[PDB]
Amino acid sequence: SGFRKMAFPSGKVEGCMVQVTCGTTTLNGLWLDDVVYCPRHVICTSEDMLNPNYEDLLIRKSNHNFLVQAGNVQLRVIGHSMQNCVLKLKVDTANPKTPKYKFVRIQPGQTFSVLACYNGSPSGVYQCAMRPNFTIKGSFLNGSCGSVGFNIDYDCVSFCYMHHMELPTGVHAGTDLEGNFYGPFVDRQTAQAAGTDTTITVNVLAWLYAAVINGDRWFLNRFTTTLNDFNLVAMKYNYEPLTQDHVDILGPLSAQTGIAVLDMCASLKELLQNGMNGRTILGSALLEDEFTPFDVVRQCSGVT
Amino acid sequence: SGFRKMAFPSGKVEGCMVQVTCGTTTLNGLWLDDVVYCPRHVICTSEDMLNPNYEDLLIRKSNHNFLVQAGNVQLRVIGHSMQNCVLKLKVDTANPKTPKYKFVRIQPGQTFSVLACYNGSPSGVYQCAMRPNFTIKGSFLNGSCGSVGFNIDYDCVSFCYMHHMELPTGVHAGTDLEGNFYGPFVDRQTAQAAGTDTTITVNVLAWLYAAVINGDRWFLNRFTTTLNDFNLVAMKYNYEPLTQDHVDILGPLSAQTGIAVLDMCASLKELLQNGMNGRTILGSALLEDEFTPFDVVRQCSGVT
Numbered sequence: 001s002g003f004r005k006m007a008f009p010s011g012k013v014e015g016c017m018v019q020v021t022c023g024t025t026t027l028n029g030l031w032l033d034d035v036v037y038c039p040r041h042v043i044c045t046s047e048d049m050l051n052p053n054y055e056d057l058l059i060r061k062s063n064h065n066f067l068v069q070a071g072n073v074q075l076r077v078i079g080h081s082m083q084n085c086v087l088k089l090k091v092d093t094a095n096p097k098t099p100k101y102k103f104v105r106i107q108p109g110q111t112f113s114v115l116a117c118y119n120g121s122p123s124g125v126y127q128c129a130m131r132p133n134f135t136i137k138g139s140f141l142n143g144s145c146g147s148v149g150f151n152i153d154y155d156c157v158s159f160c161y162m163h164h165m166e167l168p169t170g171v172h173a174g175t176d177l178e179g180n181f182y183g184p185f186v187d188r189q190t191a192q193a194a195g196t197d198t199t200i201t202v203n204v205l206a207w208l209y210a211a212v213i214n215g216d217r218w219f220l221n222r223f224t225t226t227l228n229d230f231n232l233v234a235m236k237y238n239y240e241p242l243t244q245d246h247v248d249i250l251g252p253l254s255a256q257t258g259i260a261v262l263d264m265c266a267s268l269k270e271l272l273q274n275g276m277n278g279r280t281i282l283g284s285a286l287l288e289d290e291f292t293p294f295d296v297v298r299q300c301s302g303v304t
Numbered sequence: 305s306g307f308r309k310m311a312f313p314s315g316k317v318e319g320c321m322v323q324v325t326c327g328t329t330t331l332n333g334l335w336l337d338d339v340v341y342c343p344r345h346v347i348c349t350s351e352d353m354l355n356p357n358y359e360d361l362l363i364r365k366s367n368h369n370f371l372v373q374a375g376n377v378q379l380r381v382i383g384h385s386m387q388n389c390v391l392k393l394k395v396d397t398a399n400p401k402t403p404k405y406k407f408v409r410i411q412p413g414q415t416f417s418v419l420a421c422y423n424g425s426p427s428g429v430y431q432c433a434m435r436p437n438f439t440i441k442g443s444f445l446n447g448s449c450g451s452v453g454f455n456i457d458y459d460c461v462s463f464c465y466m467h468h469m470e471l472p473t474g475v476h477a478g479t480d481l482e483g484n485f486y487g488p489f490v491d492r493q494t495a496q497a498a499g500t501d502t503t504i505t506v507n508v509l510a511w512l513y514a515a516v517i518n519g520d521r522w523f524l525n526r527f528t529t530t531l532n533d534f535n536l537v538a539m540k541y542n543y544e545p546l547t548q549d550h551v552d553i554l555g556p557l558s559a560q561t562g563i564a565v566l567d568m569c570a571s572l573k574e575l576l577q578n579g580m581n582g583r584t585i586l587g588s589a590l591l592e593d594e595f596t597p598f599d600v601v602r603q604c605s606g607v608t
C-alpha cells in the first residue's frame with residue numbers, strides 16, 4: 001500500500017536524448033531510428049523571438065549547421081525538414097537504443113511522465129497531467145526545450161509531448177511529436193491567453209478510490225447524489241462536468257471497493273462544499289487531479 | 305520555473321534489476337558487477353514469517369536453489385552469503401550494464417528516488433524522504449521487495465535503500481545495501497513500533513525558498529525570529545529543532561533570494577501558528593518536507 005505521484009521508468013527515453021545546436025542556441029532532441037526531432041525554435045536568435053519567420057530562418061540553414069551530439073558522439077545530418085513546430089533532422093545512423101515507440105496525441109486530463117533534460121542529458125523525471133486548457137504545470141528551466149512527455153505500455157513508449165515554451169504566467173506549452181501545439185499556443189515570445197482551466201473530476205474521483213484502497217476513508221459518508229446534482233456542484237467549483245463515459249471508466253475502481261460511483265460523487269460533493277477541515281487524504285490537503293483511473297489501477301495492481 | 309517532486313532518471317538502475325526466486329517466493333534483486341543483492345526473506349515460506357531462523361533456512365539452500373533471471377536470461381549462481389538482512393548471490397557474469405556506483409547509508413531527512421519493481425521489471429519511479437523515524441512513506445505492493453532507493457551524482461549511482469517490509473501501519477522499512485535496517489526494524493511479520501516522527505524543518509525551509517524562487521511569495525512577512533524562539537514553535541508543532549548546521553546548509557538559498565534564514569523561519573513560524581488560510585504554496589496545501597536544500601538548488605539550476 002501507499003500512493004505516490006509515480007512516473008514511468010525513464011530508461012527507454014534516456015537512450016533517445018541528444019543535444020541539438022543551431023548557431024548559438026542549444027536544446028534537446030529525441031533520436032528515434034534515423035531521425036532526431038526537436039523544437040523548431042532552435043533556429044532562432046534573440047531578435048527573432050517576438051515573431052520569427054521560421055520558413056525564412058530555416059532557408060538560411062544547411063544540414064551541416066545542425067550539430068547533433070548523442071552524449072559524446074557526433075551524428076551526421078543528411079536531411080532536415082520542418083513539420084508544424086518541430087524539426088526532423090535525418091541522420092545517417094539509426095539510434096541503437098530506439099525502443100518500440102508510437103507518437104500519440106493525448107487528451108486533456110490524461111497524464112504522462114516528463115524526462116527533463118539539459119544539453120541532451122537527463123536531469124529528472126516527474127508525472128503530470130495535460131490540463132483541460134492544454135497547458136502543463138511542469139518544472140522546466142531555460143535549455144529544457146525538446147524534453148519529452150511519454151507513457152509506457154509494456155515495451156512500447158508512446159511519446160505525447162515535446163516541450164517548447166514557458167508562458168509569462170509560468171505554465172508550460174508544447175506540442176505532440178508531429179509539432180502540433182496542444183492548445184492555442186504559438187512558438188513566439190508573446191503573452192498568450194491559456195483558456196479557463198478546470199479540475200479533472202474523473203481523476204479526483206479516481207484518487208478518492210485510491211485513498212479508500214490505501215486506507216484513507218474518513219471522507220466516505222452516508223450520502224448519494226445524481227449526475228445532474230453533482231454537476232451543479234462541479235459547475236460551482238470549476239470542475240469538469242461528469243459524464244456516463246467517466247462513470248464507465250471508474251467502473252473497475254467502483255467494483256474493487258464496492259463504492260458506487262455516485263456515492264463517491266457524494267463524498268466529493270461534501271469535500272467541495274465543506275473543504276478538508278484541516279485533514280489530509282493520501283498526504284494531500286487538497287483534492288488531487290493528476291491521477292487517471294488507469295493510473296490508480298496500475299499503481300494499485302503492480303503493472304511493469 | 306515550476307517545482308515538482310522530481311525523481312532521478314532511473315535508466316542506470318533499471319539495467320541492474322533482476323528477479324530472484326528461492327522455492328516459492330519471488331522478489332527483486334540488484335545485479336552490480338558479479339553480485340546480485342536481495343532481501344534475505346526470499347528464503348522464507350508462509351510458516352517462517354513470524355520469527356524466521358535465517359541461518360537455518362539458508363543452510364537448507366544451495367547455489368542452484370537461487371533462480372536469478374535478468375529479463376529473460378538466466379544467471380548462474382556460484383556462491384551465496386548472508387550479510388545482515390541481505391543475501392549476496394555471486395554469479396558467473398558481471399552485469400554489462402553496471403553503472404559507476406557506491407553503497408551509502410543515508411541520513412534521516414535526506415531524499416532519494418525509488419524504482420518500484422515486480423518480478424525484476426521496473427514499474428515506476430518516485431522521490432521520497434527517509435523520515436526522521438527511519439521509515440519511508442512509499443508505494444509498494446507484495447512482490448516489490450528488493451526494489452531500491454538511490455541518488456545519482458553525475459555518472460555515479462549511490463544506492464541507499466533496499467525495500468524489505470511494509471509495517472502493519474502501512475509505512476515502509478528497509479535496509480542499506482549492506483543489509484542493515486534503517487531504524488529499529490527486524491525482518492519478521494510482527495507489529496513493530498516506528499518511533500515518533502517529526503517534520504524535517506530544514507526541508508520545509510528549503511521548499512519555502514523554492515516557492516519564492518518560483519513566484520509564490522504570499523507567506524513572506526515583516527517579521528524575523530531567533531533560533532531559540534523558532535525552536536519553541538518547532539517543539540510545539542513537532543518539527544525537528546533547527547541548528548546552525550541547517551542554517552549553513554540553507555546559505556546558498558538565502559543568498560540566491562536575499563531572504564535571511566531567520567526571516568524565512570519567521571514566515572514558517574507564522575504558517576505553523578496560523579495555517580495556510582485556504583491558500584497554497586507550489587500547488588500544496590500543506591508544508592512540504594520532502595525536498596532538501598540540495599534538491600531545491602539542483603531543481604532550480606538544471607543539474608544533469
Ligand SMILES: CN(Cc1cccc(Cl)c1)C(=O)Cn1nnc2ccccc21
Pocket residue numbers: 041044048049050052140141142143144145164165166167186187188189305
Ligand atoms: C525561448 N522560450 C520562448 C520561446 C518559445 C518558442 C519559440 C520562441 Cl522564438 C521563443 C521559452 O519559453 C523557452 N523555455 N521553455 N521552458 C522554459 C523555462 C524557463 C525559461 C525558459 C523556458
Ligand SMILES: CN(Cc1cccc(Cl)c1)C(=O)Cn1nnc2ccccc21
Pocket residue numbers: 001345348352353354356444445446447448449468469470471490491492493
Ligand atoms: C513479506 N512481508 C513481511 C516480511 C518482511 C520481511 C521478512 C519477513 Cl519473514 C516478512 C512484507 O511486508 C513484504 N512487503 N513489503 N512491502 C509490501 C507492500 C505490500 C504488501 C507486502 C509487502
